[PDB]
Design an enzyme around this catalytic site. Structure first.
Site, PDB file in Angstrom:
ATOM      1  N   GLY A 148       0.858  -1.186   0.142  1.00  0.00           N
ATOM      2  CA  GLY A 148       0.174  -0.067   0.016  1.00  0.00           C
ATOM      3  C   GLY A 148       1.036   1.152  -0.103  1.00  0.00           C
ATOM      4  O   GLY A 148       1.961   1.296   0.138  1.00  0.00           O
ATOM      5  N   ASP A 180      -2.573  10.605  12.262  1.00  0.00           N
ATOM      6  CA  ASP A 180      -3.500  10.122  11.164  1.00  0.00           C
ATOM      7  C   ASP A 180      -4.154   8.627  11.594  1.00  0.00           C
ATOM      8  O   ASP A 180      -4.065   7.808  10.827  1.00  0.00           O
ATOM      9  CB  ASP A 180      -2.171   9.719  10.055  1.00  0.00           C
ATOM     10  CG  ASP A 180      -2.792   9.213   8.689  1.00  0.00           C
ATOM     11  OD1 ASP A 180      -3.852   9.720   8.240  1.00  0.00           O
ATOM     12  OD2 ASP A 180      -2.070   8.687   7.948  1.00  0.00           O
TER      13      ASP A 180
END
Ligand SMILES: C[C@@H](O)c1nc2cnc3[nH]ccc3c2n1[C@H]1CC[C@H](C#N)CC1
Length: 292
Positions: free
Chosen positions: A16, A136
């Protein structure tokens, strides 16, 4: 031991990307017989002076962390003949919590969601001891170690607080996960332990939606804002909505006591949000008191 030789690091698969880095699944194979360990390797797409400095900071951050609910640092590879840098982490085969929950949503009951929730809080308590702000938190960034254990799995935006300062202003040029941001992050670019607590509330929301697409934070906020809105108008409306108590709804099937935890995290008053220690205790007390 924390230095991996580029000649033995073999690409297997893309895992990813996020922010300005990509993570790949690689075999480290010193025996050169296809039997070596699999690791996760993070690389930068552009080693500018700024991006490289930030990446070195990220590497130092992850290296400094040793906790059951934080992905393990393994080392660095000084690739391209020591003219490039890659970060080596443990590889977790079950992948992200986001995808895991979307796949196993029948298997995974509330007690289990609370177990994962607890573990995320404990990893975050640990981060706070180092004065690190994650910035995040999202289920996309949580990894599944096994059916009973998760780990915080990426630290690409993590910052160290200035000494005795409660926040860090990050005037970031470019995109941001605005639908996870605390209001003061949106309005003043201020990130803190308390803004991580806000975003943790959004993670808890994500878990209890079981990642049903139409129930995602972006889908719900855009529904409230107006799906037609584009660009800065989205941000103007999101800020105005949040300042005056607009919130994500209680997920279908979510116990009201769990929704109350989310709503307490989503306090506009930074100093009134609970601590991660408060949250871990509360969540574990709920789990321990449940019927089974
Ligand atoms: C497929 C994706 O969810 C994934 N699977 C992983 C297995 N092991 C890993 N070890 C470290 C990261 C990592 C992994 N990541 C993601 C996690 C989030 C990251 C970011 N940003 C990209 C790779």
């Amino acid at each position: 031991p924390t230095q991996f030789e580029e000649r033995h690091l073999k690409f297997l698969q893309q895992l990813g990307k996020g922010n300005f880095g990509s993570v790949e699944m690689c075999r480290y194979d010193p025996l050169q017989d296809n039997t070596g360990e699999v690791v996760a390797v993070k690389k930068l797409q552009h080693s500018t002076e700024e991006h490289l400095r930030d990446f070195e900071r990220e590497i130092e951050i992850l290296k400094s962390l040793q906790h059951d609910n934080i992905v393990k640092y393994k080392g660095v590879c000084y690739s391209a003949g020591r003219r490039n840098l890659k970060l080596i982490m443990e590889y977790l085969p079950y992948g992200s919590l986001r995808d895991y929950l979307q796949k196993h949503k029948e298997r995974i009951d509330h007690i289990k969601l609370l177990q994962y929730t607890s573990q995320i809080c404990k990893g975050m308590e640990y981060l706070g001891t180092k004065r690190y702000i994650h910035r995040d938190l999202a289920t996309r960034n949580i990894l599944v170690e096994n059916e009973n254990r998760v780990k915080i799995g990426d630290f690409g935006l993590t910052k160290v607080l200035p000494q005795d300062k409660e926040y860090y202003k990050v005037k970031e040029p470019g995109e941001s996960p605005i639908f996870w941001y605390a209001p003061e992050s949106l309005t003043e670019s201020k990130f803190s332990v308390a803004s991580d607590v806000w975003s943790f509330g959004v993670v808890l929301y994500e878990l209890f939606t079981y990642i049903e697409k139409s129930k995602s934070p972006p889908a719900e906020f855009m529904r409230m804002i107006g799906n037609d809105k584009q660009g800065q108008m989205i941000v103007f409306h999101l800020i105005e909505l949040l300042k005056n108590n607009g919130r994500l709804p209680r997920p279908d099937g979510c116990p009201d006591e769990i929704y109350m935890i989310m709503t307490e995290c989503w306090n506009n008053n930074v100093n009134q949000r609970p601590s991660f220690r408060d949250l871990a205790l509360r969540v574990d007390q709920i789990r321990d008191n449940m019927a089974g």
